[PDB]
Ligand binder design. Structure first.
Ligand SMILES: CC(=O)N[C@@H]1[C@@H](O)[C@@H](O)[C@@H](CO)O[C@@H]1O
Ligand SMILES: CC(=O)N[C@@H]1[C@@H](O)[C@@H](O)[C@@H](CO)O[C@@H]1O
Ligand SMILES: CC(=O)N[C@@H]1[C@@H](O)[C@@H](O)[C@@H](CO)O[C@@H]1O
Ligand SMILES: CC(=O)N[C@@H]1[C@@H](O)[C@@H](O)[C@@H](CO)O[C@@H]1O
Ligand SMILES: CC(=O)N[C@@H]1[C@@H](O)[C@H](O)[C@@H](CO)O[C@@H]1O
Ligand SMILES: CC(=O)N[C@@H]1[C@@H](O)[C@H](O)[C@@H](CO)O[C@@H]1O
Ligand SMILES: CC(=O)N[C@@H]1[C@@H](O)[C@H](O)[C@@H](CO)O[C@@H]1O
Ligand SMILES: CC(=O)N[C@@H]1[C@@H](O)[C@H](O)[C@@H](CO)O[C@@H]1O
Lengths: 142, 142, 142, 142
């Protein structure tokens, strides 16, 4: 099994406050499950080769997704911003597979990624434990 | 908009205790979002014609999904039991659409549904507010 | 240290639906902390001789407290029903100590307790692991 | 009635990550209740003259309390850091009343407060809606 445990940091009240509105798990590698403990979020997966997505909405209406997973035994991540209401995590998660338009990002096996949305919100995913089967990352909104 | 607010009742400790492991929203009708308040769960959707799925796992390992949505201005529900780890909510939710194998169940526009899993767990979804745009249902595990 | 992990089973929609409105920890035995994981609640305490209280409110306005702790190396529990709004958990938890009016109930060291309230709600606390330092109980509203 | 709604912003992973371990409500003004919605925390109180406390613990072991309430129709707040395990919120909340050692801080009726702890964690409470019965504040750990 692989697990990825996420801690969500929110830095700047001027951007609003984000909460989870959707959590998906892709079906490869015997799937997996999201759980919550002590304010953190863990994605537990049946092996290497799958992922999950958290979609967040701010109290100012902004929609963004955070994807994390393991590809060929190495962690990966992505953040997609500027989403329309119909672009749910259910739409987004599969786009990393089956030659979809986000596969290239999974293939990078990134330990960190940064993006600013068009409306000016900074997002970062930074793995703090980057190797092995019990991975850890901070997700930072600013 | 349509909303469906769910209250989860668990009746029988002998079946174990269930918690949410995934929440999806289908992309029709401008999508929608899950939220939590006072121990309840609300799916807020952009109009009639979409749905969302909660997947639950018990502390005894059982996996089941609960689907709720609105089809042609009437509520619907379903429960799928006996799921394998790879049959995530991300797999299940789309199966109600595009002539998928669960579409017939959405088309029934049920205000209640009952099923017992092969391992003996009873599940019921029962709408308590069955008309209008602010729907309410109890989800009962036993 | 001692821990008590609680699973809350709400059986009967006719009583309405309860959510937590307060959680206290008494200061003996070097105190302790409440945490949440996978829909459960754990009180971790620094030794034998302290306790914590969860207060619940139903969406029909009913207020009740559940107390759990360890007294002379044995678990105890209590449920107080029919509470007024001014009777917060902060009021109730100390009443088990300093020769307060609920001390006798702590002293019973009960592994199960059943009480039905003035509005008809049935409450049960039943420990499923009743000995040792890693205690487990079901809290059932019916 | 008065309500205070809190949004918790954790800015700095270097301080570790905090989660709630206790929530108390003082018994004046007919008491009150904590609730959670969309990742936020609301204390609802029966009138002016009471308060509640959230205690937080970081995954590095740090214990701190945030107190919020209404005194003579004006909001107040306080943050206490460097707490010992025996100094539970149940100990701290009453210290603002009955001529206790923190009463002066309540009496200040602060709309903002900044304190940095012995281990270097910066805390700020800042009310964003500072008048009326529907109060709002950001709680920032940095
Ligand atoms: C071992 C491993 O991670 N295998 C994965 C496989 O499961 C699938 O995700 C594929 C997608 O292009 O990428 C890899 O081959
Ligand atoms: C108005 C309405 O609910 N329309 C829906 C549409 O959105 C889609 O879900 C379709 C699937 O067969 O079922 C209906 O036509
Ligand atoms: C060892 C042990 O549990 N000691 C406790 C002590 O901590 C205190 O709670 C007292 C209350 O009357 O009951 C016992 O003596
Ligand atoms: C109206 C009002 O806020 N009254 C309060 C009262 O309830 C109590 O908290 C007291 C503490 O010294 O401070 C004020 O007098
Ligand atoms: C502005 C923005 O959010 N762009 C995203 C980018 O972050 C992401 O890596 C890519 C692949 O999923 O899709 C979009 O280009
Ligand atoms: C035993 C079991 O869970 N059967 C489910 C049924 O409940 C559901 O309505 C149907 C359509 O989704 O799929 C399966 O037949
Ligand atoms: C009806 C009711 O809630 N009675 C409670 C009882 O359960 C509790 O054990 C006792 C001591 O705390 O106080 C009250 O008698
Ligand atoms: C370093 C620290 O946490 N000091 C606190 C201060 O913040 C608080 O206002 C006061 C009254 O409660 O108690 C302590 O002096």
């Amino acid at each position: 099994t692989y697990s990825i445990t996420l801690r969500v940091f929110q830095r700047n009240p001027g951007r609003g406050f984000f909460s989870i509105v959707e959590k998906t798990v892709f079906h490869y590698a015997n799937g997996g499950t999201w759980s919550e403990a002590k304010g953190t979020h863990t994605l537990t997966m049946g092996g290497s080769g799958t992922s999950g997505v958290l979609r967040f909405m701010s109290d100012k209406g902004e929609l963004i997704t955070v994807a994390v997973g393991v590809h060929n035994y190495k962690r990966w991540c992505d953040v997609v911003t500027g989403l329309k209401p119909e672009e749910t995590a259910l739409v987004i998660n599969p786009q990393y597979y089956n030659n979809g338009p986000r596969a290239y990002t999974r293939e990078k096996q990134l330990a960190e990624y940064n993006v600013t949305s068009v409306v000016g919100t900074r997002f970062e995913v930074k793995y703090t434990v980057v190797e092995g089967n019990n991975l850890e990352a901070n997700v930072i909104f600013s």
